[PDB]
Design a protein around this ligand. Sequence first.
Ligand SMILES: [Mg+2]
Ligand SMILES: [Mg+2]
Ligand SMILES: [Mg+2]
Ligand SMILES: [Mg+2]
Ligand SMILES: [Mg+2]
Ligand SMILES: [Mg+2]
Ligand SMILES: [Mg+2]
Ligand SMILES: [Mg+2]
Ligand SMILES: [Mg+2]
Ligand SMILES: [Mg+2]
Ligand SMILES: [Mg+2]
Lengths: 184, 186, 184, 183, 186, 189, 189, 188, 183, 183, 182
Amino acid sequence: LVPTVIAFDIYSRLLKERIVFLNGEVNDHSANLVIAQLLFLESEDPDKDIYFYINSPGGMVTAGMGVYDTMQFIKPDVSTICIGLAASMGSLLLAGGAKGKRYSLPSSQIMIHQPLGGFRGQASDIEIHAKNILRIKDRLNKVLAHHTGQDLETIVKDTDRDNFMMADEAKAYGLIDHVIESRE
Amino acid sequence: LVPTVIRAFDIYSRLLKERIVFLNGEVNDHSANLVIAQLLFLESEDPDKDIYFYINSPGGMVTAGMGVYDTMQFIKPDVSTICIGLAASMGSLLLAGGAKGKRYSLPSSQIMIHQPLGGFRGQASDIEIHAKNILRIKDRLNKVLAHHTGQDLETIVKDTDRDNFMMADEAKAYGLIDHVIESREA
Amino acid sequence: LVPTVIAFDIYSRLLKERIVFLNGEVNDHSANLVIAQLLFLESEDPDKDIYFYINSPGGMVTAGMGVYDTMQFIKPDVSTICIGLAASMGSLLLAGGAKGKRYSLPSSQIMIHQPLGGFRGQASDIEIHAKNILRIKDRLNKVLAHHTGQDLETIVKDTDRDNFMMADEAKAYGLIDHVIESRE
Amino acid sequence: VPTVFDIYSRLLKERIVFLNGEVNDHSANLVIAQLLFLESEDPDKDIYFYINSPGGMVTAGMGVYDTMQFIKPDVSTICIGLAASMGSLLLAGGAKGKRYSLPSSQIMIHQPLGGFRGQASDIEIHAKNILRIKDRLNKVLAHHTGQDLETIVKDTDRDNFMMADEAKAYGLIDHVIESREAI
Amino acid sequence: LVPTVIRAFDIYSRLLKERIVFLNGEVNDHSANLVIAQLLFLESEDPDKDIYFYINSPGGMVTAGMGVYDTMQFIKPDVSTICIGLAASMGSLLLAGGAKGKRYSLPSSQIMIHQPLGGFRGQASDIEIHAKNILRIKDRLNKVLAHHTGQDLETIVKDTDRDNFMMADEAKAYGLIDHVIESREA
Amino acid sequence: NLVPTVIEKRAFDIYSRLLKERIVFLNGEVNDHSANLVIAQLLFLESEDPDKDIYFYINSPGGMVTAGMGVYDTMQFIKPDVSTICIGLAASMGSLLLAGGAKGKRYSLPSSQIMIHQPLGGFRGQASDIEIHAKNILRIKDRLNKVLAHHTGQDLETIVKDTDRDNFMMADEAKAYGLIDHVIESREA
Amino acid sequence: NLVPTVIEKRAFDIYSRLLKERIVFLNGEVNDHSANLVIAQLLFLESEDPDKDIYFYINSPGGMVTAGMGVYDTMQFIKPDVSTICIGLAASMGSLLLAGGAKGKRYSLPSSQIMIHQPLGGFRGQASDIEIHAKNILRIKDRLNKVLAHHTGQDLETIVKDTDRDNFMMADEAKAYGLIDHVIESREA
Amino acid sequence: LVPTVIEERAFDIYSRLLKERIVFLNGEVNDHSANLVIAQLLFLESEDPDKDIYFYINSPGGMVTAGMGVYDTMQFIKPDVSTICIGLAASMGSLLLAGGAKGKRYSLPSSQIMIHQPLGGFRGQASDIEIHAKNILRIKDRLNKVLAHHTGQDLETIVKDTDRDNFMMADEAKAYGLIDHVIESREA
Amino acid sequence: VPTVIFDIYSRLLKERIVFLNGEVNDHSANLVIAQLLFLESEDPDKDIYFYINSPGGMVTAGMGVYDTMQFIKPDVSTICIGLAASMGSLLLAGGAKGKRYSLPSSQIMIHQPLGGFRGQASDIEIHAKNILRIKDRLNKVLAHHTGQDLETIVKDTDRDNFMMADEAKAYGLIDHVIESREA
Amino acid sequence: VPTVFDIYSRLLKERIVFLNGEVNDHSANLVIAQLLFLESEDPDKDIYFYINSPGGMVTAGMGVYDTMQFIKPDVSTICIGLAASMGSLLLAGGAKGKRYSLPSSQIMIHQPLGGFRGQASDIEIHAKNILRIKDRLNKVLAHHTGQDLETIVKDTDRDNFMMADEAKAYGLIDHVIESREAI
Amino acid sequence: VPTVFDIYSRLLKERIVFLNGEVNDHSANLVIAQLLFLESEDPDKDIYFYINSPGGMVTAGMGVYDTMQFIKPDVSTICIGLAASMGSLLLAGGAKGKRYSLPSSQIMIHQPLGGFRGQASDIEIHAKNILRIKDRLNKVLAHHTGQDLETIVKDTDRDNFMMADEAKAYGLIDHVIESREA
Ligand SMILES: [Mg+2]
Ligand SMILES: [Mg+2]
Ligand SMILES: [Mg+2]
Ligand SMILES: [Mg+2]
Ligand SMILES: [Mg+2]
Ligand SMILES: [Mg+2]
Ligand SMILES: [Mg+2]
Ligand SMILES: [Mg+2]
Ligand SMILES: [Mg+2]
Ligand SMILES: [Mg+2]
Ligand SMILES: [Mg+2]
């Protein structure tokens, strides 16, 4: 369990310095917590940068798109910093940070790919969910193309299967802006 | 559990000497393949004589079932179908695909038609491939029913969107069977 | 497991005397076995009575209606004999024996009631299955009215809940014709 | 199951039938099939019904009991170990003067067990039925034992175990036998 | 897990001081009742000020959800709804039932509408009672959506027969929300 | 881990805040735990002010009859009027507690479902024991029905007939049956 | 307990009867057991008559690659032509065995589904061990593709591209792809 | 289930092929499966000591003690036991294959043959861990020596090549010395 | 279980070959015993060939087999065909003098008995005492058949002790290691 | 968790951080939060990172490793029990000249574990990635130990356990300390 | 657990530390944290370490042993129930002259337990390592008991159970203590 300082828990103390963590999978709970923290920080000061550290294998697309929209929505710039892994919705959040303020530590791993899903039921219902998952796939691809500056087709091609990049490769792909090794 | 008759046979083996075959319970690879084996056997014994295929099934796997349908249409002998209890999903498809004029049901049978079920989990690309395939199959099954019942394809499509239960006399008016028979005497 | 005589199993030996057993629940397997035996017996001789002993708590309506239709369909009269319990599809099979040849031993229990079922899913699908189960209920009631000579309404009223009768009460209701205590 | 056909079929050829283990639809029906079959082979010769059973389903058991009374042959009963619940009912329902027990057997009588979950209306219905069954079971015992109904009602309120001689004194069996060579 | 702010509050308690309330995850008795409590509280603090109800929910129990809908319409303050991720089943119903003109969604939200689910097992009589009830409720829910979206009832009925997914801009054209907002600045 | 929580200045949550205003919630199934919580709150409010009305919001599928009858009795027992408000479902013991609110102070919001029906139970055991519990569940069925008859004003026979199976009512039908007094749609209205 | 069964005059079932006519079935998943049964039957038929064709009916979703390749090899190995008939599904190893039937003697009934795709596997362990099994599953993927390329007449590259994901074909499309030679609808036709 | 052939004397398919001195190891090596093979071998020898026996193998391997008994029996009985791989021969499976009669070890063209070291392990006291560790090391060395002898490879080469799972196609197996011939068709 | 002109085990039984294969339990032990008694009925003076591939198992069941081997007239020769550990290695060593065989690749293991009791101190004491008696008798049986001193056996069975076939011969657990039938 | 706030927070006030038990996203993030926080309080004072860990998730661990290099303060590391897998990587990545171990500690290095089930194409992709990760992990160790890459590759093929002095000799730590009072 | 501060934190104000129950990473690390803290508060004052434990993980437990040897304060140990496996090794590793046991305690010693599943190669590595560990703990026992290594080895082959008086005689503790006043 979490350490206390001065009386805050450790994460509360960092929140005081506008530092937010996404750690582990993206689900409704973890997404909402991040969103509440971002809204809180904007309330505290709508002009100061926020620092959003990411270490996530991804998870639920709808939960994650909420976090992503909240980032574009609030007034403060949201700088992103990958501190281990950003895959699936992880990489999308990372790449959706404020322009020029997307970072990774040197040894992180970044992974992009297409949506996973599935429905059992009537042919009719499978059609409906298959069409919708196809729309979602196209729209995630368009968010990646926008943030990376890659062509849509390039994004499509590169997400067909699990695509793993080191920090330096992700910066060259446009998923982030800087690899940082030292505070200095 | 199956009683024996004597030079010893089980009850089903004995009824098979009279060209009676059953499909009972779920359509799966095991049960469908058994029927196919019997039909091939019956054809081998006599190419001309009717076969009597008693059906009481909630349906099951489409591919397994379609093997039985193709075998019925394939072999020389006429396969007469008789519903005895239930024919639903692939069950009613097999019922409807019996020899022209030789599709029967006992008075209390329930007959149900509807669209295929399935679904996959996986990458969106995989889900797309399987979605398209289930659509082709849904289409092909409706065309089978249209052909055997005499209904328009569009009518079939409308009527199988959700589960559709029919009494024996309604299934006859619909074209899924030819005769409702209540008495061997009649 | 089952005894051998002379080489038959015990049930095979009785089948030689046109005796068929329904024992335990009605399902696709037990129903089909009975049906195959009835068809077999008619094949052997289409004019001799068949004796169909019942001890069943009932079970699946579609499986059971097949057995019932097969009884009315084949040429031989099918006499019925309750030897313990006939409830649900059990009582319906018993009562559907050949006119004047429906029997029970003195201590049997006979039970009638309405259909049980259920579906989870969309409102639309629940409607479809609710309508169908209502048709089935009405038609079972009409089979009982026919065989007992009771009014439809009487059958409806008396099957609303589990209705238990001793052998003598079932004979007075018309579910059977005779209570027999001794072969003589 | 030794071959000699199995051992039980060899004994069936000498008009010997076993009820061993619980009464359920399967074990009860098997017995009924053996009784109808013995009647069919010879309608006048005695039948020998060996019972070792903790009992079980009432309806399945009552079918066996009724068949015993229905067929022409006398069904002589013999307890070999335990006759409890439906077990003691079948033992006691044997042919007059021909109910036996090996000496170390236990015989237990008691009231029906059951129960339903659901609406009160349905519980009431099932309560009334089991109460009827309770009563009929008592009357069957009063009949085969020669005991007053009131006595049976009282003696079956809770589990009641008897040794073989006690079951004889009570009217559940006619004889305790120790040796075949004894008259 | 919920961070604290200082005289100490959890993050949600703090946002509640700004009249922000969340419904997140499934609608059940627990989550619905929490929202109701907050709405009653917010009304008590100030009867006139807008409340901002952020929704991200796949839906859930109809009765629990309808308590939240009635409470929104009941209390003095306007409840403004903002979809942030997903609004489906009861979720989209709550979204659509926000104050007139004050129903929003972020650009990437998915909004889905459809008919109720349920079902009972039991006696046919019981199944009939519950079947009729689910039909009344299905009807009442469609009438709620018709009223808030401005669509004809018949249109609603057609469009909720099966799951119906909409992007934010489609939900606005449909009437489920009033505005798509991408930027606090705009 | 309660929510949302203002700490002491183990925590002060939204329910404790509302309880400060004599607002009590029964949410979810009625069992020994949830019933006793309500009782404790009712007694405490009576202790703070005997005169002032209490507002009892109900959203419940019901549950255990004994636990529920403690709540019903407590409501009648304490000095304050206990106003009932249905905010989603009042089924089984739920609907009984709703109907047992102070006279003329029983409310529902417009979309609530109110359901009445007979008790459910069950016992496995000896015939004797089944007889005993069968008689008892019938006395309780009778008592529950008498309670509803008293608060609705229907005849007992009417209650009996209407509860033989699940009986769903909308809020307006509940008012016309006498289970609540007012359907309220808006605070200002 | 086999079916349906004529005893000796442990039993003589419908499959044994049909085997008397050189008819063999692969039904359901391909595993060590089901594959070996087919092999045994094939060897036995070769022993009874080396010259006479064998009729191999397939209805299978496929399964284990090693077990399946024994069947494929045995078919090519024995003297008799082995005719293949698809009677429902030939997927995965199923479709391979179908395509591997004697030249010009590979059939499907009209409604069959034929599916081809790449192998599936998986290993948990040390990087080294994952490397080894990864290389191997790629050699096998290559071999499977070469087999289909040989029997269909497609170029290897075509096979590779067409099997990257599940690829469903109707019977007539399977014939045009070269996986079977004839779609047969009627015995007399 | 297993088909039947009548002569009336009914036997299952496997018994019928046994009349032609054909034996199958199919699936995992364990006490039950190894023993049946051994019983058959003993039976075939008694029936005719001189005639070759055909041992078809499709096996992922399994229990080493069970396997070594089959192996010892092959070497022990008078008749030559010819081995044919039909699918897979891994672990004890490849050992049994390779241990067939000199020049009469076959595989079909698509078989995979895999060799590697033994697996096991005990849980308990350090003393027992030690005892079992020493044993499994002897067994590892013995197994290696056995392959070396049948393949003709030198011991060190075997050791190097079995440190991790090592998968071979049939032709690579012939070249390694695990089998003598790859056969594609009966006529050739 | 293949059929040859009954099963292959029944066929090899016609030649006085018996297998213990897999663990020693009641069922598996009784089968062996039954076959020993049968082979004796058939021919009292003819040798029996007892094949062993066993991890051992239940001591009491095993001792029944061991005793039966010494009780019947026929010499029971033992052949280890893979593994003989625990009771397995005891049955191997208890074969007829000079007729104990192993194939070359067999593993043979001896150790002390394992057991378990939970309960009262008194009951633990009683069972502890008895397993110690049994440990002792087993060491005595091995000492007698090996030629080894009791104290050597005790030292050597304190923990699992694995021997290759030639080690077991040198130890005295078998008499011969055989590689080919002709030799 | 004793109060003095808990014991770990009291020590955090003296710039002491613990990694205890497996590395996963949760335990790794906690540490990172403590490192960013100490940097924030005082960017020049040394940090004391106590490690007792069997290791765990590579990505979670690499985040901790990177943060250690990124922050201004020197992160001095101390092994207190075990440092295996990611544990020995974090210990070894400590500030030059300031990597310590209590004397009885075990230090274990080895290659990555993983694996995927699925199509060959996907297995190939995951195989290549873990091979890259294997390599980078080796290069990190070669860097902090001063060892040749080839040496690391060979010494991590299988589990490799070292005692504290062996880990020092190997370059994984700088000092084995026994007493605080010792210089 | 009661509040006075919970009860344990209260006793910690007097430099009392409990190890109670199994030795694992969590319980071991708590103890180490308390040791370092107490050294921080006063580096000269004795610490009292009560031990009631069946033992458990060696690596976790040797962390505690080393921390005891390493901090400036003397660590006195007191067995109050059971000290088996790693438990008895912590008890025995107390400050010289300050190892106690209450009169009814059981102390037990024996060799380590473990064992891997896998390839022979891997089994051999973990076997060799557990044999080192075994020898190492044996030397520690010999060191603190004053016993010869051969003796420790012989006596820990199987579980060895001693009463408080037997343990003191064997050298695992210095004093059996029955009443605070005496
Ligand atoms: Mg922004
Ligand atoms: Mg035809
Ligand atoms: Mg008739
Ligand atoms: Mg009689
Ligand atoms: Mg409002
Ligand atoms: Mg009051
Ligand atoms: Mg060929
Ligand atoms: Mg040889
Ligand atoms: Mg002897
Ligand atoms: Mg640094
Ligand atoms: Mg010290």
